[PDB]
């Protein structure tokens with residue numbers, strides 16, 4: 001008796017990748033044509049990485065690197081949707097499911113708007129939730145800072161977890 | 165008892181003008197803020213935190229800068245609309261917390277005024293609203309006084 | 324009932340041979356410039372707690388104009404924040420923080436930070452998350468001009 005119930009947890013992820021050569025970027029599982037790619041060991045999906053770290057952070061499980069180190073061949077080159085699904089499983093094992101997530105793509109270019117709803121659908125599938133539990137938005141910094149100078153893209157993500 | 169989290173981040177550049185508007189307060193200043201609306205970075209970030217928590221997108225979806233009807237819009241009115249459509253979806257405000265990231269002007273004399281206006285627009289008590297301000301120690305675009313940034317977070321509760 | 328808060332703090336590097344983060348002394352080619360001991364991480368956590376509780380920010384409670392707090396241990400400042408948040412009726416549910424720094428390497432120090440933070444917050448270690456990341460040499464953190472921290476907190480009614 002007298003156990004904890006209906007507990008909730010907050011997490012926040014902030015990720016950055018710099019532009020490099022390529023013909024597209026990948027955000028939220030969606031390939032977006034662009035004259036640069038993002039520099040990364042795999043697909044450079046800044047949005048899914050930030051969401052992953054928000055989930056792990058809420059669960060006090062560290063960050064992606066703690067669970068998928070580069071020394072581990074299993075996850076070498078892994079698709080970031082597959083990584084996110086593995087994060088969801090780890091967090092579930094610890095007793096937590098997703099209540100909702102909200103994320104902000106900080107990018108001067110390309111435009112994110114036409115891709116947002118597709119991202120929401122894929123993220124919701126990977127998180128095991130309804131689309132109404134997932135929000136993605138975007139903003140520029142009005143040509144200020146490293147995102148404004150088109151040097152890279154940043155994402156802020158927050159997550160609220162609920163006890164399973 | 166269900167709840168939702170949201171986060172908003174907004175930036176506006178300085179431009180010509182004699183005041184800025186933050187949290188509904190007009191602060192005399194050497195520059196204004198450039199924006200389609202009145203440029204209230206703080207109310208924009210709060211609006212996006214609320215829309216984000218309710219999975220309703222962002223303020224640019226609801227009040228596009230391609231629509232001249234929203235030119236110079238009072239961001240308090242935009243925020244009140246956000247509160248209304250969040251309520252329609254079944255949520256009210258639990259609490260909000262925001263950080264103004266600005267090298268200048270000093271926000272301190274205006275914080276409590278901002279809290280009262282924000283609480284009124286959100287339909288909550290002043291104790292459910294926190295506003296704070298910080299500098300970046302003259303680093304980065306806010307430190308060079310190129311613009312102002314705001315981070316806001318919101319927790320929604322079931323109506 | 325629960326409450327959300329967020330803190331963001333930045334300090335610039337200055338001449339020195341260590342920094343203090345999460346209560347831990349980390350050797351470095353520079354120090355951090357600050358009125359206090361410069362612990363960006365504890366400052367951001369303090370502001371997330373105060374923000375959630377609608378108690379303002381840490382400068383309201385420990386003004387930089389007061390010489391008595393010059394060089395102050397940011398853990399002691401945090402312990403006071405925890406006490407006044409409790410007096411208002413709130414305790415910590417969990418916190419999550421991100422150190423944004425190109426250097427020094429934070430990884431060897433994180434578990435030590437979590438232990439000190441959890442003690443100061445009056446919670447278990449499994450209620451405290453700290454992670455570190457770079458901006459891939461972009462921006463003022465990428466140019467090694469300073470360190471930033473983002474922290475979020477969820478408070479629970481006492």
Ligand SMILES: Nc1ccn([C@@H]2O[C@H](COP(=O)(O)O)[C@@H](O)[C@H]2O)c(=O)n1
Pocket residue numbers: 106107108109110111112113114137138139140141142222223224225
């Ligand atoms: N890279 C970006 C940046 C912003 N946007 C969208 O543009 C609108 C206005 O953004 P700004 O306020 O940054 O101009 C928002 O609705 C935002 O989601 C976008 O679709 N792609």
Ligand SMILES: Nc1ccn([C@@H]2O[C@H](COP(=O)(O)O)[C@@H](O)[C@H]2O)c(=O)n1
Pocket residue numbers: 265266267268269270271272273296297298299300301380381382383
């Ligand atoms: N633009 C700003 C920036 C900070 N401040 C206040 O100054 C104090 C210290 O902030 P800094 O250490 O960032 O200078 C804080 O309490 C903050 O509320 C302000 O009143 N206006």
Ligand SMILES: Nc1ccn([C@@H]2O[C@H](COP(=O)(O)O)[C@@H](O)[C@H]2O)c(=O)n1
Pocket residue numbers: 063064065066423424425426427428429430431455456457458
């Ligand atoms: N200042 C820093 C930045 C990152 N890190 C470590 O580097 C890992 C990967 O971070 P980046 O992707 O930012 O390089 C983190 O999970 C953390 O263990 C660190 O230990 N100190």
Ligand SMILES: [Mg+2]
Pocket residue numbers: 015016017044045046049050
């Ligand atoms: Mg990444």
Ligand SMILES: [Mg+2]
Pocket residue numbers: 174175176199203204205208
């Ligand atoms: Mg705006």
Ligand SMILES: [Mg+2]
Pocket residue numbers: 332333334357361362363366
């Ligand atoms: Mg500080």
